[PDB]
């Protein structure tokens, strides 16, 4: 509403002033935390763009380098798509604190259970070896970029929540407290003007009696 339900008195005035000061210090705390998260967001965006560009050029490298190692082992398409026992890249979740928020990122626990060991010892050697080296490094780099994107998303939503809280404390709460402070000042000023009138009446009656008697 336009005011807080309280009764005008010189005790309600200090209570309301305490409330106002507390609210407008909390506002500054939240306004600092939001800009911390915002700086982190603007950094994550830039380095995500750079990692995107570099992994894209790496992907084009791998695209033009696939054919030469393909030319040395026949056609292992059925071999690769039907024979898959156990992938040896794994991923786990870890946290990273930023101003109280817990961004989730990824840890790359490197497992080893290599099934692709036959791989034509005499039909495809260094070619396929460097090929899987390339693509494993690419897998790890894109793991890094995925962790960056996960951070990005959680940070982006927490920024919105904190800005909503700041705007609420700034547009809804503090104006209401200030309104119910101005009202209390007015009402105390109004209580004083009645005691003044009563005392002036008493004095007037005194100075009427003493003179007519």
């Amino acid at each position: 509403k336009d005011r807080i339900e309280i009764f005008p008195s010189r005790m309600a005035q200090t209570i309301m002033k305490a409330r106002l000061k507390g609210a407008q210090t909390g506002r500054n705390l939240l306004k600092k935390k939001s800009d911390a998260l915002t700086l982190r967001f603007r950094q994550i965006l830039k380095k995500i763009i750079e990692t995107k560009m570099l992994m894209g050029e790496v992907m084009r490298e791998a695209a033009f380098s696939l054919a030469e190692a393909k030319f040395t082992a026949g056609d292992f398409s059925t071999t690769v798509i039907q024979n898959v026992n156990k992938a040896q890249v794994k991923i786990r979740a870890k946290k990273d604190n930023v101003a109280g928020v817990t961004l989730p990122v990824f840890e790359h626990y490197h497992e080893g259970t290599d099934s692709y060991e036959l791989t034509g010892l005499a039909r495809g050697g260094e070619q396929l070896a460097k090929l899987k080296r390339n693509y494993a490094k690419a897998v790890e780099l894109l793991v890094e970029l995925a962790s960056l994107q996960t951070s990005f998303v959680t940070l982006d939503e927490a920024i919105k929540i904190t800005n909503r809280r700041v705007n609420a404390i700034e547009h809804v709460i503090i104006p209401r407290i200030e309104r119910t402070l101005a009202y209390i000042i007015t009402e105390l000023d109004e209580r004083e003007r009645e005691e003044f009138y009563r005392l002036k009446k008493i004095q007037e009656k005194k100075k009427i009696l003493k003179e007519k008697s």
């Binding site: 008195s9 005790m11 200090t14 507390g22 705390l29 604190n97 101003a99 109280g100």
Partner: protein
Amino acid sequence: PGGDFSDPVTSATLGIVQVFWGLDKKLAQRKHFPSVNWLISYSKYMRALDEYYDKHFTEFVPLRTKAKEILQEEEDLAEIVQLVGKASLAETDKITLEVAKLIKDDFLQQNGYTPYDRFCPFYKTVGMLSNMIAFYDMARRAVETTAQSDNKITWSIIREHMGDILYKLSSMKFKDPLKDGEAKIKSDYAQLLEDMQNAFRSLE
């Protein structure tokens, strides 16, 4: 007249008296007794009492000073932990909070309707405060010196190691000055001090 600090009687009185023991309504609502504010109360005799303490209890004034500093730092941190929520806090802030809670719950808080906490002699008071402040100093030093070394010490691997030293402190207020005595209680407190010293020497 409702709780106003500017009642004409209360404002006329505060200009004359030298000691003011204040009333905390929030403490009387949570049933913490005696409900002394300890942040608006004052005494103007703490400089005329100096040569009495410097002759009878020569180690009390530093304990009083440090206790008051701890109780103010806790109030500074409280309205921060309220908004953000104690996630990102230095370990020294954790120790400040968890020693201030001890001081509040076990030293300042007293029960007059019990046969041991009805009248607490001053040797009991000084002993309790001395042991609590000694623990504070030891914990803070431990966490402060091994700050960037290996095996970073924290408040959590202190509450693990010494969990029963943190219980003889939270139960110093149950000794009785008429079933026990002066030398008995003093011996107990000295033994507890040696215990916590040994624990802080072993852990660190």
